[PDB]
Symmetry: D4
Amino acid sequence: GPGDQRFGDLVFRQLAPNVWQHTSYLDMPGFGAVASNGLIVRDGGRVLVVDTAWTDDQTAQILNWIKQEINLPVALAVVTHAHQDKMGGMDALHAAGIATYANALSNQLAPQEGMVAAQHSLTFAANGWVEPATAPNFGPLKVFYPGPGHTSDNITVGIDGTDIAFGGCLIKDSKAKSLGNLGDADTEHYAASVRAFGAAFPKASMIVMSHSAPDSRAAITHTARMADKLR
Amino acid sequence: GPGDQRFGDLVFRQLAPNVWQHTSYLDMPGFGAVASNGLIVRDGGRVLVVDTAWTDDQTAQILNWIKQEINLPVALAVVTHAHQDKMGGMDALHAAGIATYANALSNQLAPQEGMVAAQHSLTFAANGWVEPATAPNFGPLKVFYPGPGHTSDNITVGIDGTDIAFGGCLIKDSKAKSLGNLGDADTEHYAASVRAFGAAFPKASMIVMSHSAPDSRAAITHTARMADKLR
Amino acid sequence: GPGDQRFGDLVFRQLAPNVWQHTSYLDMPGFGAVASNGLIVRDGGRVLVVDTAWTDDQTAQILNWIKQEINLPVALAVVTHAHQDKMGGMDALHAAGIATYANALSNQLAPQEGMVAAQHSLTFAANGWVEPATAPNFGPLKVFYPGPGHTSDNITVGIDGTDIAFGGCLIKDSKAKSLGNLGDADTEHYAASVRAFGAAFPKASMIVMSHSAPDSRAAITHTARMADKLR
Amino acid sequence: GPGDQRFGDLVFRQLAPNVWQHTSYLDMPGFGAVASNGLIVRDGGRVLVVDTAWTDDQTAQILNWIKQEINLPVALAVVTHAHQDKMGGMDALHAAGIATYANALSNQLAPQEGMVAAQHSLTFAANGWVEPATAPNFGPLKVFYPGPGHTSDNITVGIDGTDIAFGGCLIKDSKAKSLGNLGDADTEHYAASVRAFGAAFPKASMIVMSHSAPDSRAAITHTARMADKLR
Amino acid sequence: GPGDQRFGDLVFRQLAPNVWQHTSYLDMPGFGAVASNGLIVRDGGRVLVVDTAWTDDQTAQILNWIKQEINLPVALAVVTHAHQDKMGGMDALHAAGIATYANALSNQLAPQEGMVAAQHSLTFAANGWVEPATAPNFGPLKVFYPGPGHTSDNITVGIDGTDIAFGGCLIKDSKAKSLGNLGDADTEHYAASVRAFGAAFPKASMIVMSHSAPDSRAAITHTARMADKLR
Amino acid sequence: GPGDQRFGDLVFRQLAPNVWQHTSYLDMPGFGAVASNGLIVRDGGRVLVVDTAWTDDQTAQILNWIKQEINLPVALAVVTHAHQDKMGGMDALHAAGIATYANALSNQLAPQEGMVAAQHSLTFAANGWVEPATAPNFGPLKVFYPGPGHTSDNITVGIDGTDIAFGGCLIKDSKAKSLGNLGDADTEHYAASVRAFGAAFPKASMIVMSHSAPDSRAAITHTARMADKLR
Amino acid sequence: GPGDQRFGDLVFRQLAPNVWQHTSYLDMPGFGAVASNGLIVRDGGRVLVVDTAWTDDQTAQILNWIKQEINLPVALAVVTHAHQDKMGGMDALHAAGIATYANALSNQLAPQEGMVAAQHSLTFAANGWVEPATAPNFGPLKVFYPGPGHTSDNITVGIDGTDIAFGGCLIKDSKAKSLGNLGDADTEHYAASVRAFGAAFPKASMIVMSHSAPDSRAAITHTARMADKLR
Amino acid sequence: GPGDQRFGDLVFRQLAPNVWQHTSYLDMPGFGAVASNGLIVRDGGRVLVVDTAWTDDQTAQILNWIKQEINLPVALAVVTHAHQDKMGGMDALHAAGIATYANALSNQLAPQEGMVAAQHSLTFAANGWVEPATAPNFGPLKVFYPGPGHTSDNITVGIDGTDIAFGGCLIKDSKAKSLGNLGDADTEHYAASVRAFGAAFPKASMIVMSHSAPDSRAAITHTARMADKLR
Ligand SMILES: [Co+2]
Ligand SMILES: [Co+2]
Ligand SMILES: [Co+2]
Ligand SMILES: [Co+2]
Ligand SMILES: [Co+2]
Ligand SMILES: [Co+2]
Ligand SMILES: [Co+2]
Ligand SMILES: [Co+2]
Ligand code: NI
Ligand code: NI
Ligand code: NI
Ligand code: NI
Ligand code: NI
Ligand code: NI
Ligand code: NI
Ligand code: NI
Ligand code: NI
Ligand code: NI
Ligand code: NI
Ligand code: NI
Ligand code: NI
Ligand code: NI
Ligand code: NI
Ligand code: NI
Ligand code: NI
Ligand code: NI
Ligand code: NI
Ligand code: NI
Ligand code: NI
Ligand code: NI
Ligand code: NI
Ligand code: NI
Ligand code: NI
Ligand code: NI
Ligand code: NI
Ligand code: NI
Ligand SMILES: [Zn+2]
Ligand SMILES: [Zn+2]
Ligand SMILES: [Zn+2]
Ligand SMILES: [Zn+2]
Ligand SMILES: [Zn+2]
Ligand SMILES: [Zn+2]
Ligand SMILES: [Zn+2]
Ligand SMILES: [Zn+2]
């Protein structure tokens, strides 16, 4: 004990001595309140953020929680693709003077997706790993592009020094009944991309995702199996 | 009763309490007067236009008919590809201060096709549906890119709250003897694109097209069959 | 009777049968709650907005008030310069699909001022009046650039069919003790610009401004006199 | 004998064995039908056009008159500034495949003036004469930029081998009561620009202008005198 | 009688009452003097040029021959790809004020090929035929892009009203021992492109090419057969 | 005690509990070893750097000294103009992943000055103070553009919470015999710019400059007097 | 005798009367000091450089060695791909005023690879050989793009008048146990690219590479065999 | 003895052991054959060229003369303004692979002047001297922008190690009757610019110019006196 901290409209669940999952909620007609998960990482003397909340106001609340509970500057934020639940709060990050990073493709896609682009673009080598020159001061954040799946631009993040890997919206939990919103999905390459994510972080035992509590590696396998049925 | 209204050089046929088909004519050496069809949609307190007439003057006549018969501001116009019969009257729309929208590819293609580009570009998700952020205030207009067919950029429009779907020049009537002008056609993907249009609006029973009176879904099937013979 | 309507955190004061002043408030350390004024114009079947509120949330409240009290589409919005109290709520307008307009210089200045640029740029003739081609569907809104003053980009708006002229932050009331925030001011040309505004709308008897209740033409004279002391 | 030829809605007056003045009319509320004048020049085996008519349709009529009465290809057209009466018919010229030329500033100004830009830009030396490299195949057309006056971009044309100089809208006849539309005028430099035009073509005895029948050099002097009263 | 006219360093052979072949020579170490052929077309009252000579000086000689023997303005020139023998004389054309046209790809390729780009870019429909809007005043010149072969950008020209088709360097004579310079060749698509050229001008009986006297359709067949051996 | 710390080839002199002056040296033929001064500021949990050293290697040594003696991340660096002694070490900062800032004009000037541009551009209001939106996380660093002097782009920095103002190369000590390198100087505005710097930081009692130990406000007065003799 | 010259931190081994191999070293955690090889070519009265050293300082030492041992201007440098060991010293070359050349793709890739781009871009024909117009004054340097392998942009250089071909990092020695760093490798096309290199320089008997002493053609064969196991 | 060498159509006069004046001629209707002068400088092991000849062919002859009489690579060429006599032969320099340099303004002006731009742009400090970073390997060539005169872009060159300064077309000989072609002249600043040139090279005793044999400093004084009469 104790339990997941409620701060404002958000929930923070500590996953590791230096890692927290931030959760925000959006009301969707019929589907109740839909949770979206991101991460907060303390690395020495600075905080790293993965994904925004649904909105600018919710994202501001994240920064407030950080200030109150951690009290270290937020050095940077990386967002995992151009959808509202991951990049809906970019303005809040920028207003706070936080350097933001996204896949170059995410920034390209941002206008048509109605999102505000990140200030900096990540570029990835042919093997999927981020080119280090485009990801300065990322520290323990290992960024990997597994290929097109949930979206064309979806990227994933592993946390060095932990057993945690963040699949974002590419990954669903081990009992999910569907792959959810496939509006921007690449049905052909989805399955391969899921498995590439698993191979990129072969030792991760806690898989964090956007819309379900952290699961085991079974989440990866189950998602890839659902994705096979699309091609 | 009564019949199709003649206004100036144009004909307007009411298809629904809030939908009219606008028809303009161009003299083509040998082929008599060739009709081109577009749509006019009343949605609450504003009018939406699909496609221009062959010319700027004819398009001005459309706007005049709207003012006389409907008397609501034309909020926007969407044009379905970069050919004279669909975008020949862009200048008239722009002179009237009407916001115009086309497929991004249509605007790219406009100069080589001798057309004036729309002021705004539509972008489509991988599944063919327009990204909502690029189509503000479209209301009941459901815009879908079925893939290359009549042209590389041809798009289609369904009207929510009705049984009407507009195939433009992609679709021919159920007894057409050919697919017409294939000067910019994608013979390989034409058939698949036609069928994608049909699947995108599976409940539509009135199929509107550029050069023939509204037909049934048989128009879709027959067009796809003719298109099969090209690949 | 009755009095100024309170809606959410905002106040709306009707100035004319088709004109309302919208007021929003921002807490400034020491200066209490500082009011910023804009305008709302009903012109036939559509609403025109002049200036946003301080914030996106407050601006959303403006749109909500319009929907409840007027129930007509907001055809466009024009913002009078790149400062928070005039352009702080651009995102809210854009999210609502409202076409936004600003001085071309305002859009140029927006990034350095930390503002979101308008979607469309206004250009002005040498005499100060907006070039009509860049201001489509403005209706009764007569837009005039009086020259540099409060800022380099500040523009003014007269409302045809009324005795109302909006000076924005260029004009202060007839008893103001100073010209306020001169952080971006052109001290040399301020006085001349104020007088140009007065001459541009010579018949206006109700002068609306950003931070004080509507005043008479004495507001113009008094502001110009204060501005003389800067050069 | 005989008199000025009426062709369609236009009037053509022969000024020289190889020069005609083309006149088109636009209805202006109160000011009756307002004439705008341009020039047509036969130079050997090709026709040169100075200025369009008010509209695209009227400009098409010019080309038709040329074909019927001269029957030589229109090698090029030069337009004298970005206003409707001079550049309102650009689309007609471009549709006919005619190479169009304007002051670089005119093309820059075209969008805000609601005009279609010329395809090619003229650049002028410090002395006001067109740089020959930017005016290929102009033949007897001597193009001169006298400085800002009626507009910032207004240019003038002399016809080599004749006593004719075209002042466009910069020049008014010797009994004009005002300088007309000063909406885009440079009141400071107008007078000097008029006199520069006169000095550029010191031997011209027939001065052609936009809105009045050809006059003598008294038109230049009288215009410059009216312009003096603006500074 | 009589024979092929020698003018300066060039040879002109009349192929039709309004068509001449222009030939220029360049010394290549070992291969003697290598001839390159282009075309000259009289169409009414103007001359059309296909391809330049090897050099600017030789191209100037072409223009001089035209002036002496035809005495009509050269309305335009089209060049068939970005190699020295086809575009080596662009500067001479531009100095003479002649509007030049090339495949858009040719202009893109011009810098790396050490060529001066044409002033205007031709764009081709999916079927290979030039989009008319990009080829104004081409008259009897029917321009067709057969696909990649000799180069990626090579285009071909048929002359309406004659039995002549110009294959440029894509086509070799019916007894050629090789396809010559394949330095920029597309060995995979060469054969298909040759046959597409033949199909595009199915009635042409005189096939003109760059490096050999006009041949029959056997030149097309033989070239395609040689090209088959590359894939 | 004790004295100025020697670290590598550099000297660090503590000016305040959170401010150090960094000094690097470059051998100039005849003028011995020429010192260039910058600043290092500790603000809470991060370090701020003003100006680089002469070279990349020397600048790397600065970062090493910071790590050893302070052990806090360098959040950002601001450089005061595009000359070797101020921006010669940009590559070292960028290699370390440090966000760099300069006057927009400095970045514009960087190529011609042979300098590497900063990653971010500072923009200044008309009154000379930096627009806050372009200077995120600057903390106690108050950046002011005094106008052209030593160079066109020279900027100055005050340190909030101290009596220190940094004039860079604009200011010389109170006994300097000349204004030094005037190769890029604005001789007309130099004097006024010096006095503007003094007025911008009216309470500063320790004036830090590039080439001489910290002096009093007499440095400002004396520099302005020398600058008067240039106009 | 004698042996390989040690100059500063570098080693120079003469391969031919006008060719030297330059070697620089970088400490890699665990892998000892890793050598990277480039070439130096004397061609008449000027020196040509292939590849930089790991660092700017090491590259400066190369230039110093050239000055001391050869004493001819370095006309140009060509770098073989965007990695530290080949382009890490670009700044040193540029500071010395040496014209630098790289594959256009290398310059495109330079930012994401953290490299400084070359000043000029090489473009290659479809057959792999450099387009001569983009490689002026290269002399005996025959530059060939074999296709993607070690990286997407890797190019190779043969030295005319010698038996030497430089494979860079594409080629490993005849007993290498792996293909080394495959972080940016194209595993699919690597093998074919290696063999293309061999075919491009079929007579070369001394194969020079980045990380091993010059070997025979067995290096090519062995590398291609290792590369086969990747696809 | 002996006299000025005639090579082809050109004359070369040796001014110093390492400096030659190159002269080319162009026939101008009435003014006989007009000479234009440039310079050739041997600096160690390479040749530097100042200005081209009137034409590409004449410029090629310059390069041929250099090869025959000096036999050293031409490292670079600098051209002194965008007029035919100074930049008419740029193509010849570029074809030979010679790096060309001009005032940035000259390159900007080149298209309108009908000139081919230099490959590299020179930028000048406020004092008129070229910024060294933009003039690599210039050696003894001291380049100075004296301000607008003959043209807006005219630059001047001094030769270190000699008593020679090249004024180009800015300077006329000590008995010239006029300032010649003032078509692009700045009549206001001409005089001051001439005197600035004189002050920039205060020790030069041989003044070289475009259209007259080398003169004394009296050429400078006399030119400045003629220029005074223009303002
Ligand atoms: Co937002
Ligand atoms: Co039109
Ligand atoms: Co906002
Ligand atoms: Co038009
Ligand atoms: Co040429
Ligand atoms: Co550096
Ligand atoms: Co470097
Ligand atoms: Co040339
Ligand atoms: Ni940044
Ligand atoms: Ni990489
Ligand atoms: Ni695939
Ligand atoms: Ni499962
Ligand atoms: Ni818009
Ligand atoms: Ni989408
Ligand atoms: Ni396909
Ligand atoms: Ni059927
Ligand atoms: Ni205007
Ligand atoms: Ni002023
Ligand atoms: Ni008062
Ligand atoms: Ni053109
Ligand atoms: Ni000129
Ligand atoms: Ni003036
Ligand atoms: Ni009079
Ligand atoms: Ni087409
Ligand atoms: Ni293919
Ligand atoms: Ni055969
Ligand atoms: Ni500001
Ligand atoms: Ni000043
Ligand atoms: Ni003193
Ligand atoms: Ni270069
Ligand atoms: Ni090539
Ligand atoms: Ni492949
Ligand atoms: Ni082996
Ligand atoms: Ni400088
Ligand atoms: Ni001046
Ligand atoms: Ni004299
Ligand atoms: Zn998503
Ligand atoms: Zn069509
Ligand atoms: Zn303000
Ligand atoms: Zn006008
Ligand atoms: Zn070729
Ligand atoms: Zn400095
Ligand atoms: Zn590598
Ligand atoms: Zn000149």
